[PDB]
């Protein structure tokens, strides 16, 4: 039991750090000109699409998962 919880928690920290340093990169080391129409730049072009859709997914999963649990409880 300990080993599983140990590695899973470490995994979470490691995952969050990756995204953190990814952001540090954009603020500090990203050159807009070098990456012109690059695969990376185009990601920052449809940022709204990505964020909005991820939001919808979260909402869908959240409403129904919680809803079903509460139905069963009641």
């Amino acid at each position: 039991a300990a080993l599983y919880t140990h590695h899973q928690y470490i995994a979470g920290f490691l995952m969050v750090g990756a995204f953190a340093h990814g952001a540090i990169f954009f603020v500090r080391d990203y050159d807009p000109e070098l990456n012109k129409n690059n695969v990376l730049a185009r990601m920052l072009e449809h940022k709204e699409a990505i964020i909005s859709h991820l939001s919808w997914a979260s909402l869908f999963l959240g409403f129904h998962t919680l809803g079903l649990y509460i139905h069963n409880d009641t």
Binding site: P32, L44, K47, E48
Partner: protein, 160 residues
Amino acid sequence: EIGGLTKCSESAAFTKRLNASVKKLEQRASQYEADSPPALALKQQVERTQARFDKYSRSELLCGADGLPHLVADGRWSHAAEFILPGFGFIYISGWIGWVGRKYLRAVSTSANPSESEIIINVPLALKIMTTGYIWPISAWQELISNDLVAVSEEITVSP
């Protein structure tokens, strides 16, 4: 059966649950007496319980070891009543609401005060627009192929 489940009509656990539930209510009714309003109520409740179990038994629902109904949603039409058919209902109603809402907002957008009509709804117009949503599937598709639904990069975007 699918997933090693058993039909509820043939599940002993399901029946045991029924008997137990009814017994509990009956034991309570014993305290009260005859036509006492409390007793009559409990008696009516057992009828509903018996009906519910019977309905589920006659259904195609599959029960597990606990004797509780388990739903199937892999796309098979054998159990469409469990998810697919009810699902269509939600989509139809939800689309209706969304479509009519968008229609009203766009309609009142060109009015003298487009923001007063959002806090104080024009009921007459709203009702008219609301009734026109029963054919939302058709209207939406028509609007898509007419390039009137999706906008074209003439919308505000972030600095980067």
